[PDB]
Design an enzyme around this catalytic site. Structure first.
Site, PDB file in Angstrom:
ATOM      1  N   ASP A   1      -0.165 -53.762 -17.495  1.00  0.00           N
ATOM      2  CA  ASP A   1      -1.106 -52.747 -18.037  1.00  0.00           C
ATOM      3  C   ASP A   1      -0.903 -51.422 -17.304  1.00  0.00           C
ATOM      4  O   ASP A   1      -1.232 -51.329 -16.090  1.00  0.00           O
ATOM      5  CB  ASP A   1      -2.550 -53.219 -17.896  1.00  0.00           C
ATOM      6  CG  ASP A   1      -3.597 -52.344 -18.571  1.00  0.00           C
ATOM      7  OD1 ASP A   1      -3.243 -51.265 -19.120  1.00  0.00           O
ATOM      8  OD2 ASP A   1      -4.783 -52.746 -18.543  1.00  0.00           O
TER       9      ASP A   1
ATOM     10  N   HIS B   1       2.748 -52.108 -21.174  1.00  0.00           N
ATOM     11  CA  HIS B   1       2.015 -51.566 -22.338  1.00  0.00           C
ATOM     12  C   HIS B   1       1.357 -50.236 -21.979  1.00  0.00           C
ATOM     13  O   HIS B   1       0.881 -50.092 -20.876  1.00  0.00           O
ATOM     14  CB  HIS B   1       1.101 -52.638 -22.924  1.00  0.00           C
ATOM     15  CG  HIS B   1      -0.075 -53.035 -22.103  1.00  0.00           C
ATOM     16  ND1 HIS B   1      -1.232 -52.273 -22.050  1.00  0.00           N
ATOM     17  CD2 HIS B   1      -0.318 -54.167 -21.402  1.00  0.00           C
ATOM     18  CE1 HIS B   1      -2.129 -52.925 -21.333  1.00  0.00           C
ATOM     19  NE2 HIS B   1      -1.587 -54.087 -20.911  1.00  0.00           N
TER      20      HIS B   1
ATOM     21  N   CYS C   1     -12.183 -49.653 -21.480  1.00  0.00           N
ATOM     22  CA  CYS C   1     -11.891 -50.971 -22.080  1.00  0.00           C
ATOM     23  C   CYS C   1     -11.858 -50.795 -23.601  1.00  0.00           C
ATOM     24  O   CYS C   1     -12.588 -49.941 -24.116  1.00  0.00           O
ATOM     25  CB  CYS C   1     -12.905 -52.038 -21.693  1.00  0.00           C
ATOM     26  SG  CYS C   1     -12.430 -53.670 -22.326  1.00  0.00           S
TER      27      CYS C   1
ATOM     28  N   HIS D   1     -12.855 -52.850 -25.824  1.00  0.00           N
ATOM     29  CA  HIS D   1     -14.075 -53.482 -26.385  1.00  0.00           C
ATOM     30  C   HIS D   1     -15.301 -52.814 -25.769  1.00  0.00           C
ATOM     31  O   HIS D   1     -16.381 -53.474 -25.718  1.00  0.00           O
ATOM     32  CB  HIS D   1     -13.983 -54.992 -26.171  1.00  0.00           C
ATOM     33  CG  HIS D   1     -12.625 -55.511 -26.481  1.00  0.00           C
ATOM     34  ND1 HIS D   1     -12.202 -55.738 -27.776  1.00  0.00           N
ATOM     35  CD2 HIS D   1     -11.587 -55.781 -25.673  1.00  0.00           C
ATOM     36  CE1 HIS D   1     -10.958 -56.157 -27.750  1.00  0.00           C
ATOM     37  NE2 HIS D   1     -10.560 -56.189 -26.471  1.00  0.00           N
TER      38      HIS D   1
ATOM     39  N   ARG E   1       0.317 -49.753 -27.534  1.00  0.00           N
ATOM     40  CA  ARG E   1      -1.039 -50.173 -27.945  1.00  0.00           C
ATOM     41  C   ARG E   1      -1.731 -48.991 -28.615  1.00  0.00           C
ATOM     42  O   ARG E   1      -1.510 -47.862 -28.162  1.00  0.00           O
ATOM     43  CB  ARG E   1      -1.805 -50.672 -26.717  1.00  0.00           C
ATOM     44  CG  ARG E   1      -3.323 -50.654 -26.862  1.00  0.00           C
ATOM     45  CD  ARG E   1      -4.005 -51.209 -25.630  1.00  0.00           C
ATOM     46  NE  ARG E   1      -5.345 -50.693 -25.484  1.00  0.00           N
ATOM     47  CZ  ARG E   1      -6.204 -51.143 -24.593  1.00  0.00           C
ATOM     48  NH1 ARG E   1      -5.835 -52.122 -23.783  1.00  0.00           N
ATOM     49  NH2 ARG E   1      -7.428 -50.631 -24.528  1.00  0.00           N
TER      50      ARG E   1
ATOM     51  N   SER F   1      -9.101 -61.744 -26.629  1.00  0.00           N
ATOM     52  CA  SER F   1      -9.955 -61.168 -25.563  1.00  0.00           C
ATOM     53  C   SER F   1     -11.165 -62.059 -25.262  1.00  0.00           C
ATOM     54  O   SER F   1     -11.889 -62.450 -26.176  1.00  0.00           O
ATOM     55  CB  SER F   1     -10.374 -59.783 -25.956  1.00  0.00           C
ATOM     56  OG  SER F   1     -10.684 -59.049 -24.797  1.00  0.00           O
ATOM     57  N   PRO F   2     -11.416 -62.421 -23.971  1.00  0.00           N
ATOM     58  CA  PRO F   2     -12.729 -62.903 -23.508  1.00  0.00           C
ATOM     59  C   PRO F   2     -13.857 -61.890 -23.745  1.00  0.00           C
ATOM     60  O   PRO F   2     -15.044 -62.190 -23.487  1.00  0.00           O
ATOM     61  CB  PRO F   2     -12.525 -63.099 -21.999  1.00  0.00           C
ATOM     62  CG  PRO F   2     -11.054 -63.391 -21.874  1.00  0.00           C
ATOM     63  CD  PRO F   2     -10.410 -62.473 -22.895  1.00  0.00           C
ATOM     64  N   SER F   3     -13.460 -60.703 -24.202  1.00  0.00           N
ATOM     65  CA  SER F   3     -14.387 -59.629 -24.616  1.00  0.00           C
ATOM     66  C   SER F   3     -14.992 -59.974 -25.981  1.00  0.00           C
ATOM     67  O   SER F   3     -15.872 -59.212 -26.388  1.00  0.00           O
ATOM     68  CB  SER F   3     -13.712 -58.265 -24.598  1.00  0.00           C
ATOM     69  OG  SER F   3     -13.366 -57.853 -23.269  1.00  0.00           O
TER      70      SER F   3
HETATM   71 MN   LIG Z   1      -6.842 -51.788 -19.721  1.00  0.00          MN
END
Ligand SMILES: [Mn+2]
Ligand SMILES: [Mn+2]
Ligand SMILES: [Mn+2]
Ligand SMILES: [Mn+2]
Lengths: 423, 423, 423, 423
Positions: free
Chosen positions: A148, A175, A186, A188, A223, A310-312
């Protein structure tokens, strides 16, 4: 003239089936000029890139979990996952060079991700060194790591620098997102703000230029945050005006019509510049992924796609237990060759310590005995860390210490330990 | 004379129930000469030592677990454990400033131990910021940390510096052991080597002096590895001569008769220069602890003790379900007021991720679902990290952002997040 | 509910001569809500803050130089300078935690600045520890440091974090400037980009709110690069609209009318939200600084100004010896109470090493002995590092070892040293 | 097997004119067993060590200075020095990851040295990067670095581990000394303690093994402090008993008859396990140096020696200016092919900043303009750092920026900068 021989070799390298799709708006001459006189080697980066490309082209799909320590990356490889995800979120939360707990607001120091990748590769190398020392073969430890780089931690030079740092640390793939660094967030999270499409492309060109100057076919993931992002820094780019309602916030952000349409527009724009396209998503919706992938294959047949599981998301709220069970196969079949549970490490670390700590307060060493018994049970499946002295390399360093003495040391560690005498 | 007050005020602070039984072979004038012209204030340390002291006297005993991340520390405090243990074994395996996976042989950089304490206190500090902003106060965040100084990472001047570093970072207590620093080893590893008693005491003096110079009543824990170590570096000290066999190793080492005998000799020597005596042990044996306790208490009635409930023991192999369950009450009764599971942090992390990764390899998001599903179930016990955006300060930093803004702010993070939508 | 006492204490500290005509668009209760349960003491920050403010109110002016090591800061205080400048430019080039040589384009990790402040304050602290042990006190060592926080390395949250970091490190003053974080350049480079006035004000509020949150009255220095900046991110601010031409760049940046009028527009806008205003400048022009002072004092009498005596100017080219010799005394009369040569460390270090190096190639120890002599001769002016074991605290750690040993010790360092023998 | 074929590649690489008369008390198979499964390339370390070896064998000798910033190393290479010394002393004083000012008493974090080698190679990489972009060849930037590993910072595995650290940072040679690691101090401090000769040999073997495992022919320099050291840990080695008086210290150290015969005993024991031998001395005595060069070459013909032209000597006290001028010329013909002013970096830095600070305190910008003018004068001889924006790579990054844009960029930094107007 080895100037003209080097530029020749740069050019030939660029013109292979890797890079088939992709555009570089710079000459080899340019790469030659900016890479200095000595070409350094980045073994783990080169290996990681080649291995990730091949996995992505030879597997149903690559499924990863985020890791925030080497020990985690190690157990992910021990279990048989073939790639490792480096979550900036997880880095902010619990693993940055500020030593702080941070929400995902780009508050941590920019060298945090690369140093963690370097730490994860180090853990993996010790695993390999240990396995090699015991003449084992059952695990290939140099799992490609996908890292990231947030929004570049600023302007394109900041992109250029972090790309190089991730390569030095040995990342297979990196990414980059189309958010305003000053306000990165974030995916999300609310409040996301886009940059001009040409802005996001400059960022991706800086990634590839960096990668070329290091001489590594590092995988660039573009992304987009445009599916939910209802704010834009500037209406200057002809491609972005169509999405501008023509109103403006008191900070002078341009309001925009987010949704798959603006997500596709950005995806199409970035794809000549990127090895893989990632469309941040509000929920796990197999249909939205089919439409995004359809849209992108429509003009870019076979272009790699990545999907954030995502766990989001509150999975069992948005989906029945059968769809969950099939989710990664389905995402697989549409072209999403790299899929990654971003915050897996955080949830695994925080929940696991909470259950142990809380039982420990209640039942003391009963709590720990139970964990140690669970660890013994798990040995049937590959697990070995219950034997923690061997696990971290007491075996390996004992054999080093014996080569150094010549067989004559009274200070061998694993010999006469509670590990050798009780496990 | 303003100097005379300062030298008086040190002395007055020494002459308190806090230092009731403990000897300082140096003078208030010494501390004055070495502490500079300006009294720097270490809030986190002072608070932690004062609370660690008060807890170890008020409470029946204090059981802790090893943290190796801020998040582990904070979930330990949330689950209602009143103190945090800092394992250097853990620093070495997965949390050190070299970014190496190491066995417990002092290979990592000496400032790794304290950087981790600061990191943890940074996290408890952010947890406290969060609860405070929400007007909650059903939890005391500033749990005192007991930290691994291994063997001082060298001579007494090294002990001096690492104690100061730990106090700077906000440790409540620091523990030193009597191993040779060049040959330091896990206490459950073979081939451990003792320094003489007088050298072991020089280290604990250097540690109190550090603490007196910083002006903080930091708990000092003296560990003896003499219960098992059969090597000694010098025959120089009267008190140790009785244990030397007369054999010497090809390295130089004096062989000695290990046993509870040697540990009691070492403990009893150390007892007047330390707050708390920790006898390292090779199985979780209560009669051994009873014997050791009464030996120290014979001479130093009411002297504080520490027991390492080592994961390096195999608890079910060595104990029946009834003993394990009652183990910590037993120890508390005998005077072991600080009991700690050193490698808990490590085994929670490795087990939890091997298990998520393994299930995830076979069953995809079905495995991640079960973790999310468990995280929701955990809220019945007070777990909250399932809502991960709030856990790490997303809400705290919104409040800060809105105060900075007036209230006119469109880039707010938590509002519009999938966290508010789906949780 | 002692809440009401604590909020009252916050409020009172705000109605003092410190913070006269200082706007806080927030309440004491907001500060209470954000600061957490417990109030950690920042001794060096407090001292430095309080002292720097007194110095700017009792001196004709404070004149300082850039430092990029402790030793440099240390010799600046030994020479009699009363304050220390922390240059981000210098961090960029030769003192950043990425360990890269970078131009001034915010390409280095954002914690490099605060780290370097901690190191300097450490060196100064040891200088103090040494002098105190020797019973000397002709120098006061705790010269306040003024630190570059560039453009906050991002948004207001980025500003708030980096302020607090600088306060942990022990800075007395921190500057923030009104350039875009992603396009931040050296104030004497071309192609700088302003943010909107309302944006710079938000950053100066974040700064104060950080300070308030940490209970420390840190000098805030609002910089403007508006004198030379011909670009701007957004025409959203009513106040900036006048300076926009209406042209926009190919990237969308609005061209603006760079000059002392824009510099003044920003200065008057920031003045009520900072303790000190600094107008960056493209040549050392006293008339220029007169205009700028007249303008600010016109509406904000007393307001402290700061002036970069930049090495980026060719001082002979631009000025005669008469003006150069008068320069700082003139600025002082105008209200430029903090004047600082940003790259003094850089030029001193690179020059000195090049010159030694160049001579050493040709003439060997003939060259080194000239420097060694130059250094003895410097004892007339107060130099002492020529005796380099005592300079870094060999004596002081010898004093510590003796106190520890109870006078014993056959390993004292300075007894037997070539320093006692040959100097 | 491919195993036998890899083992052979090792065996063949040892069996070469490098490694000459060099004992390894292990087999190629041993290196294979411990090296893991992949072999990582280390370009700077391989180039560094091949070049250093080549210089040491083709030049009359190599003279180098100490360096504690990359900028100092940069300028050393530009003035035309063929190599750089990394000094543990300098790291202690002003360049350690503790950020502390320390005497040379092994008090700093062990990875400090390796971290500084990285920084310096980075600096030389960016200079090289610049010179390439401007298409220059006049300077070869990849000057070999000789770095201090002190006494390995612990046991032989600490030696293993720092040797690796130094290699992955790109060090060309590393030096190890036979003092006890916990009591390690300056060669010119009193109170030095020797480890047994067998133990010195393990540390060198540990060093060779690390280099062999990373597969780089790193130059190992064995150093002895047995010229001055009058203390020893153990009378165990039969080569060491002769020098034991039979007196013991209260700590239990063996008193020994220090001098050239003890240092010759150590030099001759170490010779077979090092590429270069270093005798630490108390004065710049050319006769002493001939007696050492002679003693050693009697048994180890053509063995490379190293000499510390220590700033801890008061040069024009101990020698006439005639002898000083000829000092390195003489040492050379005696076989001292590496000669280094250990503390040149400290002295250059502290002198130059003290001098400017004092002049600046009196005469303000008159002082700074004198340095700048002294800088312009230096351009006749190759200095360029007076144009400080070009020096640190503003030009290089302007080119990167322009290739990412493809020529459509309004934020070019050298365009319109004060540097391009005034220089
Ligand atoms: Mn990030
Ligand atoms: Mn330990
Ligand atoms: Mn700057
Ligand atoms: Mn040294």
């Amino acid at each position: 003239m080895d100037r003209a021989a080097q530029i020749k070799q740069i050019a030939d390298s660029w013109n292979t089936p890797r890079f088939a799709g992709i555009v570089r708006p710079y000459t080899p001459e340019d790469v030659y000029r900016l890479r200095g006189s000595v070409q350094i080697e980045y073994t783990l980066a080169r290996m990681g890139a080649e291995r990730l490309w091949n996995l992505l082209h030879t597997e149903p799909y690559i499924n990863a979990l985020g890791a925030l320590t080497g020990n985690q990356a190690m157990q992910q490889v021990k279990a048989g996952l073939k790639a490792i995800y480096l979550s900036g979120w997880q880095v902010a939360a619990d693993a940055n060079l500020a030593g702080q707990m941070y929400p995902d607001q780009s508050l941590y120091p920019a060298n945090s991700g690369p140093q963690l990748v370097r730490n994860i590769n180090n853990a993996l190398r010790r695993a390999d060194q240990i396995y090699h020392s015991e003449g084992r073969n059952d695990i290939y430890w140099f799992a490609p790591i996908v890292a990231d780089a947030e929004a570049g931690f600023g302007g394109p030079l900041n992109v250029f620098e972090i790309m190089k740092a991730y390569i030095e640390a040995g990342a297979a793939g990196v990414h980059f997102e189309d958010q305003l660094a000053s306000e990165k967030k974030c995916g999300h999270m609310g409040g996301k703000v886009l940059i001009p499409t040409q802005a996001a492309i400059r960022n991706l060109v800086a990634a590839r230029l960096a990668a070329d100057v290091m001489g590594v076919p590092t995988i660039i993931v573009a992304r987009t945050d445009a599916n939910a992002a209802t704010l834009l820094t500037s209406d200057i780019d002809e491609r972005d005006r169509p999405f501008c309602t023509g109103e403006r916030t008191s900070e002078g952000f341009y309001r925009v019509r987010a949704g798959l349409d603006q997500a596709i527009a950005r995806g199409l724009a970035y794809a000549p510049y990127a090895d893989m396209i990632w469309c941040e998503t509000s929920e796990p919706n197999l249909e939205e992924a089919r439409r995004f992938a359809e849209a992108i294959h429509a003009q870019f047949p076979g272009k790699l796609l990545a999907y954030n599981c995502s766990p989001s998301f509150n999975w069992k709220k948005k989906l029945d237990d059968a769809t969950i069970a099939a989710f990664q196969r389905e995402l697989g079949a549409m072209g999403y060759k790299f899929q990654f549970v971003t915050l897996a490490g955080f949830h695994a670390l925080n929940y696991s310590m909470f259950e142990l700590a809380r039982n420990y307060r209640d039942r003391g060493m009963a709590a720990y005995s139970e964990l140690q018994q669970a660890e013994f049970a798990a040995e049937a499946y590959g697990y070995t860390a219950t034997r923690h002295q061997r696990e971290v390399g007491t075996g390996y360093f004992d054999e080093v210490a014996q080569v150094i003495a010549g067989g004559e040391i009274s200070t061998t560690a694993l010999t006469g330990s509670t590990e050798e005498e009780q496990f």
